Amino acid sequence: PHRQPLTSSERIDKQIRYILDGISALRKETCNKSNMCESSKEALAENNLNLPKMAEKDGCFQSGFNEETCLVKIITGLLEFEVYLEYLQNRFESSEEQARAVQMSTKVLIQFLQKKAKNLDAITTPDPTTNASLLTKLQAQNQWLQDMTTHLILRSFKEFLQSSLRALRQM
């Protein structure tokens, strides 16, 4: 079935939904094994994590909406998530393709959004050295802490993309 060309915004919308679908498949696999995403003591794994999240000051919610500050926050947030998506690559075999897809699709999305931004002056790029050490730190942990880290990343990334999707529909 044929259609007209997607606009930039429609392309972005479709990209986010594709990533969410992939995150969903990853979540399903994680929660069907090991601790079954039992989350009572997840605060323990959260200590080592600085996961991006929306706040009202970011201007991504309908109330207090601000297109410029929101877009900056989404791009900055997604750039910060990338080290955590790299972490996820080793945690899924029997789902290699899916974890790979989520990671690649997020990179494509970042580029779409950076095109939409111009300028990128307010965009804080995460430090590679800090990211390499963080990744090492996360991988060194025992299996239980790694299962919890995995679940926290998936949930938090899902939440960030859901809020991003809603905000980008207003742009």
Epitope: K41, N47, N90, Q139, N142, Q143, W144
Partner: antibody
């Protein structure tokens, strides 16, 4: 019952190499992380190395004090753990225990240990 | 690597007395610390796992406490079979680390 049995211990000259073995039985060896722990005569416990499973890409970790002289490996078809030791020094003289690592990280099962003596 | 400071190195106590052994981790390890008892000529025995959970068959006079960096093993009313060497294990992140050990001996 879970059983871990070490082999390959004994005397070795300073600078030498020795390969320890551990035969595991009574559980699905493949699923578990494994550790080596050592204890010099009359001294404290010293954690040595970790061997991870297939799910974790057979990752390996070592105590830093070992300075890369040791290599851990496993053979899942034989239910066996190995510790290849190189450039041995007299301070490596110890009982070496094979051990099963918990999901949670703590050591849950231990072998009886095998003595390695480094000496001329 | 995470360093462990176990205290004291040696302890002399009477049967029926109460003792505490402390371990400090060089960084936050959550509750991922366990306590081991070792008798001469034997492999170590797990007493307390994940800071405060008693291992199967371990008498309730043994109790573990703490979270973060500071941890305590308490033994109430020492019995003769409890005199041994005790070790904490940091099992948060590899390489794992044992404390230096506490040798607990009977006062007579």
């Amino acid at each position: 019952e879970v059983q871990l049995v070490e082999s390959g211990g004994g005397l070795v000259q300073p600078g030498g190499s020795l390969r320890l073995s551990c035969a595991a039985s009574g559980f699905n060896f493949n699923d578990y992380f494994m550790n080596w722990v050592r204890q010099a005569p009359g001294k404290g416990l010293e954690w040595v190395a970790q061997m991870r499973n297939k799910n974790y890409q057979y990752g390996t970790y070592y105590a830093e004090s070992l300075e890369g002289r040791f290599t851990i490996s496993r053979d899942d078809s034989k239910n066996s753990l190995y510790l290849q030791m190189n450039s041995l020094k007299t301070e490596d003289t110890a009982v070496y225990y094979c051990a099963r690592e918990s999901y949670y990280g703590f050591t849950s099962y231990w072998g009886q240990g095998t003595l390695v003596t480094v000496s001329s | 690597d995470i360093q462990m400071t176990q205290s004291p190195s040696s302890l002399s106590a009477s049967v029926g007395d109460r003792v505490t052994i402390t371990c400090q981790a060089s960084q936050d390890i959550g509750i991922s610390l366990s306590w081991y008892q070792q008798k001469p000529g034997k492999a170590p025995k797990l007493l307390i796992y994940n800071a405060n959970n008693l291992a199967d068959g371990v008498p309730s006079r043994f109790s573990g406490s703490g979270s973060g960096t500071d941890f305590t093993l308490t033994i109430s009313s020492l019995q003769p079979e409890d005199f041994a060497t005790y070790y904490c294990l940091q099992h948060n992140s590899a390489p794992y680390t044992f404390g230096q050990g506490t040798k607990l001996e009977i006062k007579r």
